[PDB]
Design a protein around this motif. Structure first.
Motif, PDB file in Angstrom:
ATOM      1  N   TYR A  67       0.803  -1.214   0.000  1.00  0.00           N
ATOM      2  CA  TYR A  67       0.000   0.000   0.000  1.00  0.00           C
ATOM      3  C   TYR A  67       0.836   1.265   0.000  1.00  0.00           C
ATOM      4  O   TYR A  67       1.494   1.598   0.984  1.00  0.00           O
ATOM      5  CB  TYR A  67      -0.944  -0.007   1.200  1.00  0.00           C
ATOM      6  N   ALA A  75      -7.197  11.996   3.191  1.00  0.00           N
ATOM      7  CA  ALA A  75      -8.153  10.939   2.918  1.00  0.00           C
ATOM      8  C   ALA A  75      -7.997  10.460   1.481  1.00  0.00           C
ATOM      9  O   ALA A  75      -7.955   9.256   1.224  1.00  0.00           O
ATOM     10  CB  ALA A  75      -9.573  11.441   3.157  1.00  0.00           C
ATOM     11  N   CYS A 120      -4.952   8.388   1.037  1.00  0.00           N
ATOM     12  CA  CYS A 120      -5.156   7.068   1.617  1.00  0.00           C
ATOM     13  C   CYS A 120      -5.893   6.214   0.597  1.00  0.00           C
ATOM     14  O   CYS A 120      -5.571   5.042   0.406  1.00  0.00           O
ATOM     15  CB  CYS A 120      -6.011   7.156   2.885  1.00  0.00           C
ATOM     16  N   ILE A 121      -6.897   6.803  -0.047  1.00  0.00           N
ATOM     17  CA  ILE A 121      -7.679   6.085  -1.041  1.00  0.00           C
ATOM     18  C   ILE A 121      -6.768   5.703  -2.201  1.00  0.00           C
ATOM     19  O   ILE A 121      -6.945   4.655  -2.808  1.00  0.00           O
ATOM     20  CB  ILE A 121      -8.857   6.945  -1.578  1.00  0.00           C
ATOM     21  N   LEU A 152      -6.027   2.243   0.792  1.00  0.00           N
ATOM     22  CA  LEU A 152      -6.459   2.206   2.183  1.00  0.00           C
ATOM     23  C   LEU A 152      -7.769   2.963   2.367  1.00  0.00           C
ATOM     24  O   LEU A 152      -8.245   3.613   1.437  1.00  0.00           O
ATOM     25  CB  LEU A 152      -5.375   2.825   3.061  1.00  0.00           C
ATOM     26  N   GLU A 153      -8.355   2.870   3.558  1.00  0.00           N
ATOM     27  CA  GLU A 153      -9.611   3.571   3.840  1.00  0.00           C
ATOM     28  C   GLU A 153      -9.323   5.052   3.951  1.00  0.00           C
ATOM     29  O   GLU A 153      -8.196   5.442   4.264  1.00  0.00           O
ATOM     30  CB  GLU A 153     -10.220   3.104   5.158  1.00  0.00           C
ATOM     31  N   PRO A 154     -10.338   5.898   3.712  1.00  0.00           N
ATOM     32  CA  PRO A 154     -10.216   7.358   3.781  1.00  0.00           C
ATOM     33  C   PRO A 154      -9.601   7.865   5.083  1.00  0.00           C
ATOM     34  O   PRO A 154      -8.951   8.906   5.095  1.00  0.00           O
ATOM     35  CB  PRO A 154     -11.654   7.833   3.605  1.00  0.00           C
ATOM     36  N   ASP A 155      -9.801   7.137   6.179  1.00  0.00           N
ATOM     37  CA  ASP A 155      -9.242   7.563   7.465  1.00  0.00           C
ATOM     38  C   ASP A 155      -8.003   6.776   7.891  1.00  0.00           C
ATOM     39  O   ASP A 155      -7.757   6.595   9.085  1.00  0.00           O
ATOM     40  CB  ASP A 155     -10.303   7.470   8.565  1.00  0.00           C
ATOM     41  N   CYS A 156      -7.216   6.330   6.916  1.00  0.00           N
ATOM     42  CA  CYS A 156      -6.010   5.560   7.199  1.00  0.00           C
ATOM     43  C   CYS A 156      -4.923   6.391   7.859  1.00  0.00           C
ATOM     44  O   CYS A 156      -4.011   5.842   8.483  1.00  0.00           O
ATOM     45  CB  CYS A 156      -5.453   4.942   5.904  1.00  0.00           C
ATOM     46  N   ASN A 158      -4.203   6.119  11.646  1.00  0.00           N
ATOM     47  CA  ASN A 158      -3.629   4.842  12.082  1.00  0.00           C
ATOM     48  C   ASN A 158      -2.094   4.871  12.156  1.00  0.00           C
ATOM     49  O   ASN A 158      -1.416   4.925  11.129  1.00  0.00           O
ATOM     50  CB  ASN A 158      -4.082   3.737  11.124  1.00  0.00           C
TER      51      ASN A 158
END
Length: 225
Positions: free
Chosen positions: A151, A172, A175-176, A180-184, A187
């Motif tokens: 990723y 976001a 990340c996309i 990955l998810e919009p809120d990666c 993390n």
């Protein structure tokens, strides 16, 4: 930092020099300029020129009110002293682009040179990821979102601005891009780097005046005629 160039260190005169370095390097390989490029490069003793970064060089054929791509090469794999990566890129833009014949002596006089300098992407170490949007700035920072080899997402500085995004939307969307998810970005296991860039360009072949183009001066597409 550890010999890494910062964009705010590149002024119109340095852009003037990088452009002349690209110009002479090509001129030297075309057989026009008579010099020992290597010794020539080591003679430019301005510390800035020796700081490291990434660079691209594109040559555009000059016309009255338009230009035509003539060759483009850039290196983003590893940073190297500005004067060196730019000299190298200029030469490659003129002779390595798989799409055009190598530059001829006859063309050299009608090409406009463009030099792009990118800073070394660097990790944003903030142990409170919700404060992440504050450690970056739309229009200045490019982003890299990573989570293991599989990723990886990368966005240039201009993108966020031309699509009219805020800092969070920017993270976001990257990340996309990384898959990955919009809120990666919230993390801790997801690494995030930022970097900057700048562009210098002749408004005319061998012109004394150069245009400084910043990712932060790009207009939000919704305001374009």
């Amino acid at each position: 930092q550890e010999q890494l160039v910062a964009v705010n260190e590149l002024n119109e005169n340095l852009g003037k020099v990088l452009i002349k370095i690209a110009r002479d390097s090509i001129a030297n390989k075309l057989g026009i300029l008579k010099i020992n490029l290597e010794d020539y490069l080591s003679s430019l003793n301005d510390p800035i020129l020796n700081k490291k970064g990434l660079a691209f060089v594109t040559l555009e054929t000059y016309y009255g009110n338009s230009t035509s791509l003539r060759g483009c090469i850039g290196y983003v794999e590893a940073v190297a002293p500005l004067k060196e990566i730019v000299s190298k890129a200029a030469i490659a833009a003129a002779f390595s682009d798989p799409r055009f014949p190598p530059l001829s002596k006859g063309e050299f006089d009608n090409i406009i040179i463009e030099v792009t300098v990118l800073t070394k992407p660097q990790e944003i170490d903030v142990e409170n990821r919700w404060e992440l949007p504050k450690k970056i700035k739309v229009g200045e920072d490019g982003l890299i979102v990573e989570y293991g080899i599989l990723y990886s997402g990368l966005l240039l500085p201009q993108v966020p601005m031309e699509y009219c995004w805020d800092e969070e939307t920017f993270l976001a969307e990257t990340c996309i891009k990384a898959g990955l998810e919009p809120d990666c970005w919230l993390n801790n296991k997801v690494k995030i780097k930022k970097f900057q860039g700048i562009i210098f360009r002749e408004e005319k072949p061998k012109s004394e005046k150069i245009l400084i183009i910043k990712p932060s001066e790009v207009k939000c597409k919704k305001e374009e005629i």
